[PDB]
Amino acid sequence: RNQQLRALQEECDRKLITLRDEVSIDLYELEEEYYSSSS
Amino acid sequence: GVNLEAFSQAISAIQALRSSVSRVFDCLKDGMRNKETLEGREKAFIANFQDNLHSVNRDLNELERLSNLVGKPSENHPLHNSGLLSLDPYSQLLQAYKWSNKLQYHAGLASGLLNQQSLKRSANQMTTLVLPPQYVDDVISRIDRMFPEMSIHLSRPNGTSAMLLVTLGKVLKVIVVMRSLFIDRTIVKGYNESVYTEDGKLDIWSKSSYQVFQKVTDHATTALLHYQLPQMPDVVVRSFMTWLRSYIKLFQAPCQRCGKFLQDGLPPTWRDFRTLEA
Numbered sequence: 001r002n003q004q005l006r007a008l009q010e011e012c013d014r015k016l017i018t019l020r021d022e023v024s025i026d027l028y029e030l031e032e033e034y035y036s037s038s039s
Numbered sequence: 040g041v042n043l044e045a046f047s048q049a050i051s052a053i054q055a056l057r058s059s060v061s062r063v064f065d066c067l068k069d070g071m072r073n074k075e076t077l078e079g080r081e082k083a084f085i086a087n088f089q090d091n092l093h094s095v096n097r098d099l100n101e102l103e104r105l106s107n108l109v110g111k112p113s114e115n116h117p118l119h120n121s122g123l124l125s126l127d128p129y130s131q132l133l134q135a136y137k138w139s140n141k142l143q144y145h146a147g148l149a150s151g152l153l154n155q156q157s158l159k160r161s162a163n164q165m166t167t168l169v170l171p172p173q174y175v176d177d178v179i180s181r182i183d184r185m186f187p188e189m190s191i192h193l194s195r196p197n198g199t200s201a202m203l204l205v206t207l208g209k210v211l212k213v214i215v216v217m218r219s220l221f222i223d224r225t226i227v228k229g230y231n232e233s234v235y236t237e238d239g240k241l242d243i244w245s246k247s248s249y250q251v252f253q254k255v256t257d258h259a260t261t262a263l264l265h266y267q268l269p270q271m272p273d274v275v276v277r278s279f280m281t282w283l284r285s286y287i288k289l290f291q292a293p294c295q296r297c298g299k300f301l302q303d304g305l306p307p308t309w310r311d312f313r314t315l316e317a
Binding site for chain 2: 014017018020021024025028
């Protein structure tokens with residue numbers, strides 16, 4: 001069961017990292033976008 | 040080997056061997072126009088005679104020459120000639136053999152002069168500079184490992200980003216944790232101070248050393264932040280690897296004595312020397 005729930009968090013953790021990855025991309029995808037504004 | 044090219048210079052040498060004697064007799068073709076200052080003009084004659092000594096130097100030039108001969112004489116070049124009359128109308132290919140070389144040689148200059156670029160702008164003319172496939176990382180790893188006597192490894196236990204470690208002759212391994220394509224945010228240590236194989240439980244960071252490699256780490260960070268070309272990340276990581284290779288010795292100490300500080304290194308100019316001086 002422990003091992004079972006281990007997977008339950010393990011992949012989840014990976015998912016979070018994946019999220020971060022996606023977020024990171026999104027992050028970068030907006031950073032250059034922040035440059036454009038000549039305010 | 041490639042010492043054959045030296046013979047080319049020897050060619051020019053014997054060329055002078057002719058010209059020299061001509062320059063002799065031409066000097067004897069006429070006498071003193073108007074010295075009016077000294078009689079070194081005659082010595083001038085002997086001056087040309089002195090250059091004849093160069094000819095003897097040519098004979099000396101053969102001492103360094105003749106390293107060794109290669110097997111399979113004629114180097115597979117006239118094998119086409121062994122063909123029947125049907126094959127002889129084939130020399131064209133050989134011409135292209137030089138031509139292609141010239142091509143490269145031309146690019147060898149052209150690309151060189153391409154260094155002075157004129158791109159007044161680089162945006163508002165279009166993408167996805169971050170490499171999508173998680174396979175180009177392995178490609179770059181293999182390209183780096185193609186270099187000899189310098190082993191590279193990588194595990195990437197953090198996630199999508201790239202994580203790798205490199206070792207050299209000493210125990211001054213370097214741990215580089217960067218994004219998908221280009222190298223950034225690396226660190227260096229020495230003598231198991233990092234132990235990033237199973238440090239504690241995994242490839243730990245530990246952000247530390249005993250105040251010796253810290254300067255090298257900062258310089259490598261600067262080099263990473265400076266060599267970030269707009270395109271061709273493979274070129275960037277290759278340049279980074281070449282830069283890293285320059286510390287495999289840590290022996291010389293020019294433009295100073297080997298007592299200025301703990302160590303000495305800052306080679307972005309493809310040559311290391313005493314640090315804290317540039």
